[PDB]
Amino acid sequence: AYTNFDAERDALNIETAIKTKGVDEVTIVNILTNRSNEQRQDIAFAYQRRTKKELASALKSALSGHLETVILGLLKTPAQYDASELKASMKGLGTDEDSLIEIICSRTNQELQEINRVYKEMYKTDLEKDIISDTSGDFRKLMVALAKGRRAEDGSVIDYELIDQDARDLYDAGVKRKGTDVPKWISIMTERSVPHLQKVFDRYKSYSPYDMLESIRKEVKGDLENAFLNLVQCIQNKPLYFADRLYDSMKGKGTRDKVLIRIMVSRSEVDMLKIRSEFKRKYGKSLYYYIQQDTKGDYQKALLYLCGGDD
Ligand SMILES: [Ca+2]
Ligand SMILES: [Ca+2]
Ligand SMILES: [Ca+2]
Ligand SMILES: [Ca+2]
Ligand SMILES: [Ca+2]
């Protein structure tokens, strides 16, 4: 059991590290990446109590580069972190649609409920209004729909008649016809429960010569296509979705650090064991190994601790 004294000792050691000549990043990492998010909140509270300064602010001053990104993201609650990443994806004249998509397509009803609330508290506007302001067309419709966090909950009964009718409707709305009935697609894929849709997408293969992902690639393009492809992966197998995004983030020249960092920070306490298992099964070497090859120094050490172990 983690006590008040534990948080005070951690805060004391972190202050010690920060004020050490040259900054002791190793201690800061060893501690923070090996505490739960709730413990890090306790630690920040104790830190402020002892120094009269905010821990996030002190660490922003003490750290730099990608390490600073990792540690500052770890210091936020899950909902704060997601809300701030959403805010960042909409900042400026452009939109980081990949990041917007990743978060909105993968978060559950309960996660999105908290994100909607916390985003309103942090930025004083509803998440939905910022999404509307940054997006347009069917991509906007889909994002707004998902961000409500009102998907049907997993039922007690498998609705086989509806599984079949939804599969038919997805087919009739897309591959069977000229053009696409995109509102039908949005309705089915946002409203039905996840286990229901897993079965719908399998039944869909009975009607369509192409599976759901290939059908999306044939029917739609741009941000809308990107969004549906991410959504369907999240529904089918979310740990594998994140394993693939991690792989993509490191596979080539350099690193998409913003994605690597966000996934390691946000999934470390959620489903990191399943992500690792899917990753190792598909890629043959561990997530740990890929992080090792792509990153270096204290930053690498922090990501490896968030990974939690080799496979
Ligand atoms: Ca140093
Ligand atoms: Ca800094
Ligand atoms: Ca923008
Ligand atoms: Ca079509
Ligand atoms: Ca690389």
mmCIF file of C-alpha atoms and ligand atoms in Angstrom:
data_model
loop_
_atom_site.group_PDB
_atom_site.id
_atom_site.type_symbol
_atom_site.label_atom_id
_atom_site.label_comp_id
_atom_site.label_asym_id
_atom_site.label_seq_id
_atom_site.Cartn_x
_atom_site.Cartn_y
_atom_site.Cartn_z
ATOM 1 C CA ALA A 1 0.000 0.000 0.000
ATOM 2 C CA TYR A 2 1.204 3.449 -1.051
ATOM 3 C CA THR A 3 0.960 6.052 1.727
ATOM 4 C CA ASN A 4 1.202 9.809 2.315
ATOM 5 C CA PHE A 5 4.781 9.186 3.504
ATOM 6 C CA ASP A 6 5.599 7.338 0.266
ATOM 7 C CA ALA A 7 4.398 10.270 -1.823
ATOM 8 C CA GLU A 8 6.348 12.658 0.394
ATOM 9 C CA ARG A 9 9.517 10.571 0.040
ATOM 10 C CA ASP A 10 9.072 10.407 -3.730
ATOM 11 C CA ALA A 11 8.508 14.176 -3.872
ATOM 12 C CA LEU A 12 11.565 14.759 -1.690
ATOM 13 C CA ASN A 13 13.729 12.552 -3.945
ATOM 14 C CA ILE A 14 12.431 14.245 -7.045
ATOM 15 C CA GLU A 15 13.216 17.671 -5.578
ATOM 16 C CA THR A 16 16.700 16.326 -4.717
ATOM 17 C CA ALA A 17 17.148 15.169 -8.311
ATOM 18 C CA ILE A 18 15.929 18.419 -9.834
ATOM 19 C CA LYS A 19 18.292 20.508 -7.707
ATOM 20 C CA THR A 20 21.318 18.216 -8.191
ATOM 21 C CA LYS A 21 24.037 19.867 -10.317
ATOM 22 C CA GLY A 22 23.173 19.130 -13.964
ATOM 23 C CA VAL A 23 19.821 17.544 -12.951
ATOM 24 C CA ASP A 24 19.568 13.861 -12.056
ATOM 25 C CA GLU A 25 17.267 12.681 -14.879
ATOM 26 C CA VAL A 26 17.861 9.018 -14.040
ATOM 27 C CA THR A 27 16.219 9.295 -10.600
ATOM 28 C CA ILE A 28 13.330 11.390 -11.963
ATOM 29 C CA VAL A 29 12.666 8.699 -14.556
ATOM 30 C CA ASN A 30 13.162 5.776 -12.207
ATOM 31 C CA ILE A 31 10.563 7.174 -9.946
ATOM 32 C CA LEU A 32 7.875 8.633 -12.145
ATOM 33 C CA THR A 33 7.729 5.945 -14.799
ATOM 34 C CA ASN A 34 7.402 3.333 -12.014
ATOM 35 C CA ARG A 35 4.446 4.850 -10.193
ATOM 36 C CA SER A 36 0.775 4.683 -11.155
ATOM 37 C CA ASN A 37 -0.946 7.762 -12.489
ATOM 38 C CA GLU A 38 -2.781 8.188 -9.171
ATOM 39 C CA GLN A 39 0.514 7.974 -7.237
ATOM 40 C CA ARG A 40 1.973 10.664 -9.516
ATOM 41 C CA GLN A 41 -0.950 12.915 -8.596
ATOM 42 C CA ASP A 42 -0.172 12.307 -4.862
ATOM 43 C CA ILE A 43 3.484 13.038 -5.524
ATOM 44 C CA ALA A 44 2.694 16.305 -7.271
ATOM 45 C CA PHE A 45 0.481 17.316 -4.356
ATOM 46 C CA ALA A 46 3.284 16.567 -1.822
ATOM 47 C CA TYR A 47 5.851 18.332 -4.039
ATOM 48 C CA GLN A 48 3.794 21.510 -4.117
ATOM 49 C CA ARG A 49 3.184 21.264 -0.363
ATOM 50 C CA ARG A 50 6.940 21.055 0.357
ATOM 51 C CA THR A 51 8.275 23.542 -2.220
ATOM 52 C CA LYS A 52 5.345 25.864 -2.843
ATOM 53 C CA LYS A 53 5.950 25.302 -6.546
ATOM 54 C CA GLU A 54 4.173 23.106 -9.066
ATOM 55 C CA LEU A 55 5.978 19.892 -9.914
ATOM 56 C CA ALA A 56 4.997 20.085 -13.629
ATOM 57 C CA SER A 57 6.470 23.568 -13.845
ATOM 58 C CA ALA A 58 9.702 22.566 -12.033
ATOM 59 C CA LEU A 59 10.172 19.556 -14.321
ATOM 60 C CA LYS A 60 9.405 21.609 -17.417
ATOM 61 C CA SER A 61 12.267 23.825 -16.357
ATOM 62 C CA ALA A 62 14.581 20.918 -15.380
ATOM 63 C CA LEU A 63 14.091 18.628 -18.410
ATOM 64 C CA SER A 64 14.243 19.019 -22.208
ATOM 65 C CA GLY A 65 13.518 17.228 -25.442
ATOM 66 C CA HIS A 66 11.456 14.114 -25.776
ATOM 67 C CA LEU A 67 12.129 13.189 -22.142
ATOM 68 C CA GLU A 68 10.387 16.403 -21.054
ATOM 69 C CA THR A 69 7.422 15.429 -23.296
ATOM 70 C CA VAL A 70 7.159 11.979 -21.698
ATOM 71 C CA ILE A 71 7.413 13.121 -18.079
ATOM 72 C CA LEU A 72 5.033 16.096 -18.424
ATOM 73 C CA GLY A 73 2.480 13.799 -20.110
ATOM 74 C CA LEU A 74 2.825 11.258 -17.321
ATOM 75 C CA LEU A 75 2.062 13.968 -14.752
ATOM 76 C CA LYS A 76 -1.453 14.599 -16.162
ATOM 77 C CA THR A 77 -4.502 12.454 -15.251
ATOM 78 C CA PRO A 78 -5.682 10.210 -18.164
ATOM 79 C CA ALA A 79 -8.497 12.640 -18.995
ATOM 80 C CA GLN A 80 -6.252 15.731 -18.686
ATOM 81 C CA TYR A 81 -3.672 14.119 -20.890
ATOM 82 C CA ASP A 82 -6.217 13.173 -23.589
ATOM 83 C CA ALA A 83 -7.906 16.540 -23.438
ATOM 84 C CA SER A 84 -4.565 18.341 -23.819
ATOM 85 C CA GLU A 85 -3.515 16.082 -26.729
ATOM 86 C CA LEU A 86 -6.905 16.825 -28.441
ATOM 87 C CA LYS A 87 -6.357 20.543 -27.855
ATOM 88 C CA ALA A 88 -2.869 20.256 -29.356
ATOM 89 C CA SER A 89 -4.186 18.405 -32.429
ATOM 90 C CA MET A 90 -6.456 21.275 -33.197
ATOM 91 C CA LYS A 91 -3.975 24.125 -32.465
ATOM 92 C CA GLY A 92 -3.187 26.631 -35.205
ATOM 93 C CA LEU A 93 -4.420 26.854 -38.799
ATOM 94 C CA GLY A 94 -4.050 23.187 -39.408
ATOM 95 C CA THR A 95 -5.389 20.004 -37.808
ATOM 96 C CA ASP A 96 -3.353 16.970 -36.805
ATOM 97 C CA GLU A 97 -6.051 14.616 -38.026
ATOM 98 C CA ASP A 98 -3.987 11.496 -37.194
ATOM 99 C CA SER A 99 -3.848 12.400 -33.528
ATOM 100 C CA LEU A 100 -7.460 13.580 -33.327
ATOM 101 C CA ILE A 101 -8.480 10.280 -34.968
ATOM 102 C CA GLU A 102 -6.304 8.082 -32.749
ATOM 103 C CA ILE A 103 -7.798 9.461 -29.540
ATOM 104 C CA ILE A 104 -11.440 9.857 -30.566
ATOM 105 C CA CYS A 105 -11.619 6.416 -32.312
ATOM 106 C CA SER A 106 -9.940 4.495 -29.505
ATOM 107 C CA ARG A 107 -11.411 5.920 -26.257
ATOM 108 C CA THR A 108 -14.384 4.185 -24.559
ATOM 109 C CA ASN A 109 -17.669 5.796 -23.472
ATOM 110 C CA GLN A 110 -16.444 6.142 -19.887
ATOM 111 C CA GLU A 111 -13.099 7.644 -21.012
ATOM 112 C CA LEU A 112 -14.827 10.098 -23.341
ATOM 113 C CA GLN A 113 -17.330 11.141 -20.670
ATOM 114 C CA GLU A 114 -14.446 12.169 -18.453
ATOM 115 C CA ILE A 115 -12.561 13.785 -21.362
ATOM 116 C CA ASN A 116 -15.611 15.889 -22.359
ATOM 117 C CA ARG A 117 -15.927 17.104 -18.760
ATOM 118 C CA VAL A 118 -12.231 17.822 -18.185
ATOM 119 C CA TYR A 119 -11.752 19.471 -21.585
ATOM 120 C CA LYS A 120 -14.556 21.897 -20.750
ATOM 121 C CA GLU A 121 -12.924 22.617 -17.398
ATOM 122 C CA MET A 122 -9.406 23.169 -18.856
ATOM 123 C CA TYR A 123 -10.284 25.187 -21.974
ATOM 124 C CA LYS A 124 -13.703 26.656 -21.101
ATOM 125 C CA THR A 125 -15.318 25.396 -24.327
ATOM 126 C CA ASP A 126 -16.865 22.008 -25.184
ATOM 127 C CA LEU A 127 -14.683 19.505 -26.990
ATOM 128 C CA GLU A 128 -17.514 19.114 -29.530
ATOM 129 C CA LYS A 129 -17.403 22.824 -30.435
ATOM 130 C CA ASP A 130 -13.646 22.729 -31.076
ATOM 131 C CA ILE A 131 -14.048 19.575 -33.183
ATOM 132 C CA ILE A 132 -16.779 21.340 -35.213
ATOM 133 C CA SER A 133 -14.573 24.365 -35.624
ATOM 134 C CA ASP A 134 -11.602 22.326 -36.857
ATOM 135 C CA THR A 135 -13.262 19.764 -39.086
ATOM 136 C CA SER A 136 -15.809 19.662 -41.922
ATOM 137 C CA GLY A 137 -18.063 17.363 -43.948
ATOM 138 C CA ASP A 138 -18.582 13.705 -43.126
ATOM 139 C CA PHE A 139 -15.252 13.579 -41.287
ATOM 140 C CA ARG A 140 -16.723 16.160 -38.892
ATOM 141 C CA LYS A 141 -19.968 14.154 -38.541
ATOM 142 C CA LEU A 142 -18.097 11.021 -37.652
ATOM 143 C CA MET A 143 -15.761 12.710 -35.163
ATOM 144 C CA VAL A 144 -18.590 14.552 -33.393
ATOM 145 C CA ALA A 145 -20.653 11.350 -33.208
ATOM 146 C CA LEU A 146 -17.759 9.282 -31.730
ATOM 147 C CA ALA A 147 -16.752 12.031 -29.283
ATOM 148 C CA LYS A 148 -20.152 11.946 -27.626
ATOM 149 C CA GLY A 149 -19.186 8.644 -25.883
ATOM 150 C CA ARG A 150 -22.724 7.228 -26.200
ATOM 151 C CA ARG A 151 -22.054 3.940 -27.975
ATOM 152 C CA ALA A 152 -24.461 1.125 -26.940
ATOM 153 C CA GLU A 153 -22.978 -0.772 -23.985
ATOM 154 C CA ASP A 154 -22.103 -4.460 -24.416
ATOM 155 C CA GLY A 155 -25.424 -6.296 -24.024
ATOM 156 C CA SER A 156 -26.174 -9.596 -22.320
ATOM 157 C CA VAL A 157 -27.661 -11.089 -25.481
ATOM 158 C CA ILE A 158 -26.099 -11.493 -28.925
ATOM 159 C CA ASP A 159 -28.526 -9.994 -31.465
ATOM 160 C CA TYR A 160 -27.935 -12.255 -34.479
ATOM 161 C CA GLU A 161 -30.806 -10.850 -36.568
ATOM 162 C CA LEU A 162 -29.438 -7.324 -36.110
ATOM 163 C CA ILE A 163 -25.851 -8.521 -36.789
ATOM 164 C CA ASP A 164 -27.044 -9.787 -40.156
ATOM 165 C CA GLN A 165 -29.147 -6.730 -40.950
ATOM 166 C CA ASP A 166 -26.284 -4.338 -40.061
ATOM 167 C CA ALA A 167 -23.896 -6.341 -42.251
ATOM 168 C CA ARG A 168 -26.379 -6.113 -45.155
ATOM 169 C CA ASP A 169 -26.912 -2.416 -44.580
ATOM 170 C CA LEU A 170 -23.134 -1.700 -44.580
ATOM 171 C CA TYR A 171 -22.816 -3.613 -47.799
ATOM 172 C CA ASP A 172 -25.861 -1.991 -49.509
ATOM 173 C CA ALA A 173 -24.549 1.409 -48.376
ATOM 174 C CA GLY A 174 -21.080 0.970 -49.899
ATOM 175 C CA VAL A 175 -19.598 -1.732 -52.125
ATOM 176 C CA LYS A 176 -22.967 -2.738 -53.651
ATOM 177 C CA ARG A 177 -23.794 0.747 -55.004
ATOM 178 C CA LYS A 178 -22.406 3.677 -56.975
ATOM 179 C CA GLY A 179 -21.093 6.083 -54.355
ATOM 180 C CA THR A 180 -21.613 5.587 -50.625
ATOM 181 C CA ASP A 181 -24.372 6.217 -48.092
ATOM 182 C CA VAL A 182 -21.864 7.597 -45.522
ATOM 183 C CA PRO A 183 -24.503 8.501 -42.887
ATOM 184 C CA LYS A 184 -25.527 4.812 -42.761
ATOM 185 C CA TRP A 185 -21.922 3.785 -42.173
ATOM 186 C CA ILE A 186 -21.525 6.466 -39.460
ATOM 187 C CA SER A 187 -24.749 5.460 -37.734
ATOM 188 C CA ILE A 188 -23.953 1.722 -37.586
ATOM 189 C CA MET A 189 -20.304 2.088 -36.628
ATOM 190 C CA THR A 190 -20.858 4.719 -33.892
ATOM 191 C CA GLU A 191 -24.046 3.394 -32.278
ATOM 192 C CA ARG A 192 -23.688 -0.417 -32.027
ATOM 193 C CA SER A 193 -21.742 -2.034 -29.182
ATOM 194 C CA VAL A 194 -18.190 -3.123 -29.896
ATOM 195 C CA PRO A 195 -18.792 -6.905 -29.576
ATOM 196 C CA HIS A 196 -21.835 -6.515 -31.834
ATOM 197 C CA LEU A 197 -19.770 -4.761 -34.490
ATOM 198 C CA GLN A 198 -17.009 -7.391 -34.302
ATOM 199 C CA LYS A 199 -19.606 -9.896 -35.342
ATOM 200 C CA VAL A 200 -21.153 -7.517 -37.945
ATOM 201 C CA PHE A 201 -17.800 -7.111 -39.642
ATOM 202 C CA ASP A 202 -17.348 -10.895 -39.766
ATOM 203 C CA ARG A 203 -20.921 -11.369 -41.188
ATOM 204 C CA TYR A 204 -20.163 -8.543 -43.668
ATOM 205 C CA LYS A 205 -17.569 -10.794 -45.315
ATOM 206 C CA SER A 206 -20.395 -13.156 -46.226
ATOM 207 C CA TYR A 207 -22.061 -10.467 -48.395
ATOM 208 C CA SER A 208 -19.096 -8.468 -49.701
ATOM 209 C CA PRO A 209 -16.152 -9.714 -51.756
ATOM 210 C CA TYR A 210 -13.982 -7.268 -49.685
ATOM 211 C CA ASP A 211 -13.670 -7.126 -45.920
ATOM 212 C CA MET A 212 -14.637 -3.992 -43.962
ATOM 213 C CA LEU A 213 -11.155 -2.363 -44.113
ATOM 214 C CA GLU A 214 -10.672 -3.036 -47.820
ATOM 215 C CA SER A 215 -14.208 -1.785 -48.461
ATOM 216 C CA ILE A 216 -13.409 1.477 -46.682
ATOM 217 C CA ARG A 217 -10.276 1.917 -48.809
ATOM 218 C CA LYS A 218 -12.359 1.380 -51.955
ATOM 219 C CA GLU A 219 -15.308 3.574 -50.972
ATOM 220 C CA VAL A 220 -13.866 6.674 -49.295
ATOM 221 C CA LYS A 221 -10.709 8.848 -49.168
ATOM 222 C CA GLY A 222 -8.751 11.424 -47.145
ATOM 223 C CA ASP A 223 -9.588 12.125 -43.495
ATOM 224 C CA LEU A 224 -12.849 10.220 -43.635
ATOM 225 C CA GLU A 225 -11.137 7.085 -44.889
ATOM 226 C CA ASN A 226 -8.347 7.511 -42.303
ATOM 227 C CA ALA A 227 -10.968 7.790 -39.557
ATOM 228 C CA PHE A 228 -13.017 4.741 -40.591
ATOM 229 C CA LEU A 229 -9.882 2.578 -41.003
ATOM 230 C CA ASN A 230 -8.714 3.556 -37.452
ATOM 231 C CA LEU A 231 -12.191 3.023 -35.991
ATOM 232 C CA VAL A 232 -12.653 -0.408 -37.478
ATOM 233 C CA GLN A 233 -9.229 -1.536 -36.229
ATOM 234 C CA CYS A 234 -10.081 -0.225 -32.753
ATOM 235 C CA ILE A 235 -13.314 -2.178 -32.730
ATOM 236 C CA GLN A 236 -11.740 -5.392 -34.073
ATOM 237 C CA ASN A 237 -8.686 -5.497 -31.863
ATOM 238 C CA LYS A 238 -7.653 -2.432 -29.950
ATOM 239 C CA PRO A 239 -4.365 -3.757 -28.454
ATOM 240 C CA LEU A 240 -3.343 -4.802 -31.983
ATOM 241 C CA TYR A 241 -4.376 -1.370 -33.270
ATOM 242 C CA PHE A 242 -1.942 0.224 -30.823
ATOM 243 C CA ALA A 243 0.804 -2.360 -31.537
ATOM 244 C CA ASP A 244 0.527 -1.483 -35.242
ATOM 245 C CA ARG A 245 0.590 2.246 -34.589
ATOM 246 C CA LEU A 246 3.708 1.782 -32.421
ATOM 247 C CA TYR A 247 5.350 -0.279 -35.131
ATOM 248 C CA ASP A 248 4.506 2.406 -37.662
ATOM 249 C CA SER A 249 5.930 5.045 -35.400
ATOM 250 C CA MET A 250 9.357 3.433 -35.401
ATOM 251 C CA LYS A 251 9.644 1.236 -38.462
ATOM 252 C CA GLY A 252 11.200 3.754 -40.792
ATOM 253 C CA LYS A 253 13.698 6.588 -40.815
ATOM 254 C CA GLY A 254 13.766 8.384 -37.468
ATOM 255 C CA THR A 255 10.708 8.167 -35.152
ATOM 256 C CA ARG A 256 7.221 9.635 -34.959
ATOM 257 C CA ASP A 257 7.952 10.503 -31.335
ATOM 258 C CA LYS A 258 4.688 12.305 -30.721
ATOM 259 C CA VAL A 259 2.772 9.104 -31.456
ATOM 260 C CA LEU A 260 5.214 6.743 -29.719
ATOM 261 C CA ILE A 261 5.162 8.911 -26.574
ATOM 262 C CA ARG A 262 1.391 9.378 -26.526
ATOM 263 C CA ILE A 263 0.682 5.670 -26.834
ATOM 264 C CA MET A 264 3.262 4.642 -24.227
ATOM 265 C CA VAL A 265 1.969 7.303 -21.788
ATOM 266 C CA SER A 266 -1.746 6.703 -22.354
ATOM 267 C CA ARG A 267 -1.793 2.833 -22.593
ATOM 268 C CA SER A 268 0.930 2.004 -19.995
ATOM 269 C CA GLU A 269 -1.723 1.435 -17.328
ATOM 270 C CA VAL A 270 -4.537 0.288 -19.561
ATOM 271 C CA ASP A 271 -3.660 -2.629 -21.833
ATOM 272 C CA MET A 272 0.120 -2.535 -22.277
ATOM 273 C CA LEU A 273 0.433 -6.321 -21.620
ATOM 274 C CA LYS A 274 -2.030 -7.065 -24.482
ATOM 275 C CA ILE A 275 -0.313 -4.523 -26.754
ATOM 276 C CA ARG A 276 3.025 -6.192 -26.093
ATOM 277 C CA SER A 277 1.589 -9.637 -26.663
ATOM 278 C CA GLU A 278 0.037 -8.623 -30.035
ATOM 279 C CA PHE A 279 3.216 -6.758 -30.989
ATOM 280 C CA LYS A 280 5.523 -9.701 -30.277
ATOM 281 C CA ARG A 281 3.205 -12.194 -31.980
ATOM 282 C CA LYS A 282 2.996 -10.137 -35.173
ATOM 283 C CA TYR A 283 6.498 -8.572 -35.458
ATOM 284 C CA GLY A 284 8.509 -11.437 -33.976
ATOM 285 C CA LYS A 285 10.584 -9.222 -31.619
ATOM 286 C CA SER A 286 9.325 -7.331 -28.587
ATOM 287 C CA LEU A 287 7.992 -3.788 -28.372
ATOM 288 C CA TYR A 288 10.890 -3.330 -25.937
ATOM 289 C CA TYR A 289 13.414 -4.275 -28.659
ATOM 290 C CA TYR A 290 11.911 -1.780 -31.185
ATOM 291 C CA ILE A 291 11.985 1.056 -28.604
ATOM 292 C CA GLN A 292 15.585 0.167 -27.843
ATOM 293 C CA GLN A 293 16.551 0.395 -31.506
ATOM 294 C CA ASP A 294 14.704 3.641 -32.141
ATOM 295 C CA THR A 295 15.407 5.799 -29.078
ATOM 296 C CA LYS A 296 18.348 6.552 -26.809
ATOM 297 C CA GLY A 297 19.372 7.809 -23.353
ATOM 298 C CA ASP A 298 17.024 8.767 -20.529
ATOM 299 C CA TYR A 299 14.162 9.081 -23.001
ATOM 300 C CA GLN A 300 14.648 5.474 -24.071
ATOM 301 C CA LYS A 301 14.852 4.352 -20.427
ATOM 302 C CA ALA A 302 11.554 6.106 -19.637
ATOM 303 C CA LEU A 303 9.750 4.446 -22.584
ATOM 304 C CA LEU A 304 11.190 1.059 -21.646
ATOM 305 C CA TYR A 305 9.853 1.453 -18.103
ATOM 306 C CA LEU A 306 6.407 2.389 -19.518
ATOM 307 C CA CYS A 307 6.656 -0.755 -21.667
ATOM 308 C CA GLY A 308 7.202 -2.679 -18.425
ATOM 309 C CA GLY A 309 9.373 -5.473 -19.633
ATOM 310 C CA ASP A 310 10.869 -7.402 -22.522
ATOM 311 C CA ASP A 311 9.158 -10.302 -24.346
HETATM 312 CA CA CA B 1 21.651 15.650 -16.158
HETATM 313 CA CA CA B 2 12.473 22.343 -20.593
HETATM 314 CA CA CA B 3 -6.903 24.134 -36.116
HETATM 315 CA CA CA B 4 -19.841 2.260 -53.598
HETATM 316 CA CA CA B 5 12.990 4.267 -36.784
#
